[PDB]
């Protein structure tokens, strides 16, 4: 079976034997005295440990292949004039089809981020949002797919005006640097230090004004767990080590502002607190909403549009109650200072026993 234009054929139909394309495979970086970790590629113990988890790597690969094909389609049509709603809906429709959405077993890991300009992350339009993408907008397209809770967290930046070209190059270079420096036993702060050094080596000129690119210091890479976008380990931009079999989202954000984000605009993103156990609720609308969240999202993220599409209404008080109780957490848009510009690049990497796999790498980024 071959992929259509626009893509509509599910990834598992293009690979009937259920063996999915590998991402970019890298030898681990050498240590401090220059002693390589190349031995991992040829170690018989490492190869058996790697094959024991083949089903897992395979679920990430299917999810990454859906991500590559969805984002390639998005890049062909994304244009100024389109509303943010139209963009998110058109992307998500393709995403659901290619991942072959099936409850909590296959689907969308989190809402389509499409944060604009000074806003770096966690903006997706709510119903009634009339925001239209502009020619001068710098749009961060951040969307996730998953197979059995093996999440692909991968993002890029869309622009139409070439004035942002050197800002995108800085961030792409800083993300690629973090990915190169990542490895088994590598300290998280060393990855962060390498990211910062490359990011700050760039100076950009946008509309007659110059800036030394700043990494957003409170927006960081992170470990990924099953049905858990952020598994608790962070890649900080400045003791904890990356470990074998761990999965990371290596993301960087460059800014012309303060290089610090703050909560701004109305909330659209939400996610159940991963650690919260069963909570008995009698309040009818609050009980019903939590049952909708548990059935459709579990510990995966969602947005208000995803509640609207399920036929839910008059849920705002019910959602505020879940947030007040600490069952669900709101994740509002994260914005740098007014008038600033932010860019982002992100990949998902598998720290396999034999090698580092940039599973979401494409021919695009």
Ligand X SMILES: CC(C)Oc1cc(N2CCNCC2)ccc1-c1c(C(N)=O)[nH]c2cc(F)c(Cl)cc12
Q: Is 153 a catalytic residue?
A: yes
**5 labeled binding residue:** no
**185 labeled binding residue:** no
Q: Is 230 a catalytic residue?
A: yes
| Segment lying near Mn ion (by CB under 5 A), choices 25-33, 68-76, 146-154, 264-272 | 146-154
In the complex, what is the shortest distance from the CB of residue 82 to ligand X, in angstroms, rounded to a whole number?
Answer: 21
Residue 120 touching Mn ion (CB under 5 A): no
Nearer to ligand X, 57 or 331 (CB): 331
Residue 249 touching Mn ion (CB under 5 A): yes
Nearer to ligand X, 115 or 354 (CB): 115
Residues binding ligand X (CB under 6 A): 110-111, 121, 153, 219, 222, 229-230, 249, 269-271, 301, 331
Q: Is 222 a catalytic residue?
A: yes
Residue 88 touching Mn ion (CB under 5 A): no
Q: Hey, which bits of 28-160 come out as E strands? A: 106-116, 119-121, 139-147, 150-158
Residue 141 touching Mn ion (CB under 5 A): no
Question: How many Cα atoms are found within 13 Å in the side-chain-facing hemisphere of 124?
Answer: 24
The torsion angles phi and psi of 56, rounded to 5 degrees, stand at -65, -55
Nearer to ligand X, 351 or 355 (CB): 351
Residue 182 touching Mn ion (CB under 5 A): no
Q: Is 278 a catalytic residue?
A: no
Question: How many Cα atoms are found within 13 Å in the side-chain-facing hemisphere of 228?
Answer: 15
**251 labeled binding residue:** yes
Q: Which of 251, 312, 336, 357 is catalytic?
A: 251
Residue with CB nearest ligand X?
301
- Which DSSP string do the residues of 207-234 spell out, in sequence order? TTEEEE-EE-TT--EEEEBTTBS--S-E
Q: Is 181 helix (H, G, I), strand (E, B) or coil?
A: helix
In the complex, what is the shortest distance from the CB of residue 351 to Mn ion, in angstroms, rounded to a whole number?
Answer: 16
CA–CA separation, 244 vs 264, rounded Å?
37
Residue 114 touching Mn ion (CB under 5 A): no
Residue 241 DSSP code: B
* H and E: helices and strands count for the chain: 10, 18
CA–CA separation, 156 vs 152, rounded Å?
13
The torsion of the CA quartet 132, 133, 134, 135, rounded to 10 degrees, works out to: -150
Q: Which of 62, 137, 190, 346 is catalytic?
A: 346
Residue 155, contacted partner among Mn ion, ligand X, none, CB below 5-8 A by kind: Mn ion
Q: Kindly report the CA angle at 340 between 335 and 345, in degrees rounded to 5?
A: 70
CA–CA separation, 342 vs 121, rounded Å?
9
In the complex, what is the shortest distance from the CB of residue 272 to ligand X, in angstroms, rounded to a whole number?
Answer: 9
On the 0-12 / 13-18 / 19+ scale of CB atoms within 10 A, 168 is: buried
Residue 25 DSSP code: E
| Segment lying near Mn ion (by CB under 5 A), choices 155-163, 178-186, 191-199, 335-343 | 155-163
Residues annotated within the binding site are 122, 142, 153, 222, 230, 251, 346
Which residues are marked as active site? 142, 153, 222, 230, 251, 346
Residues annotated within the binding site for a divalent metal cation are 142, 153, 222, 251, 346
Interacting residues with Mn ion (CB under 5 A): 142, 153, 155, 249, 251, 346
Residues annotated within the binding site for substrate are 122, 230
């Amino acid at each position: 079976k071959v992929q259509t234009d626009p893509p509509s054929v599910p990834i598992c139909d293009l690979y009937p034997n259920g063996v999915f394309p590998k991402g970019q495979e890298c030898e681990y970086p050498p240590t401090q005295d220059g002693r390589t970790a190349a031995w991992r590629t040829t170690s018989e113990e490492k190869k058996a440990l790697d094959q024991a988890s083949e089903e897992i790597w395979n679920d990430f690969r299917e999810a990454a292949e859906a991500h590559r094909q969805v984002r390639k389609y998005v890049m062909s049509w994304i244009k100024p004039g389109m509303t943010m709603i139209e963009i998110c809906e058109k992307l998500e429709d393709c995403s659901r089809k290619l991942i072959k959405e099936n409850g909590l077993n296959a689907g969308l890991a989190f809402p389509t981020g499409c944060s604009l300009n000074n806003c770096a992350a966690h903006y997706t339009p709510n119903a009634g949002d009339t925001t239209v993408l502009q020619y001068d907008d710098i749009c961060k397209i951040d969307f996730g797919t998953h197979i059995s809770g093996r999440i692909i967290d991968c993002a890029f930046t869309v622009t139409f005006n070439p004035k942002y070209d050197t800002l995108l190059k800085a961030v792409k270079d800083a993300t690629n640097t973090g990915i190169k420096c990542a490895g088994i036993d590598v300290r998280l702060c060393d990855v962060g230090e390498a990211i910062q050094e490359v990011m700050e080596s760039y100076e950009v000129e946008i509309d007659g004004k110059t800036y030394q690119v700043k990494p957003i210091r409170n927006l960081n890479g992170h470990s990924i767990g099953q049905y858990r976008i952020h598994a608790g380990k962070t890649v900080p931009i400045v003791a904890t080590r990356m470990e074998e079999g761990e999965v990371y989202a290596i993301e960087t954000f460059g800014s012309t502002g303060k290089g610090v984000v703050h909560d701004d605009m109305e909330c659209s993103h939400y996610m159940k607190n991963f650690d919260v156990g069963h909570v008995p609720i009698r309040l009818p609308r609050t009980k019903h909403l939590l049952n909708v969240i548990n059935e459709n999202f579990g510990t995966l993220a969602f947005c208000r549009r995803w509640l609207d599409r399920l036929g839910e209404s008059k849920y705002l008080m019910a959602l505020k109650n879940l947030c007040d109780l600490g069952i669900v957490d709101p994740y509002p848009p994260l914005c740098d200072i007014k008038g600033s510009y932010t860019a982002q690049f992100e990949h998902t990497i598998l720290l396999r026993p034999t090698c580092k796999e940039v599973v979401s790498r494409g021919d695009d980024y």
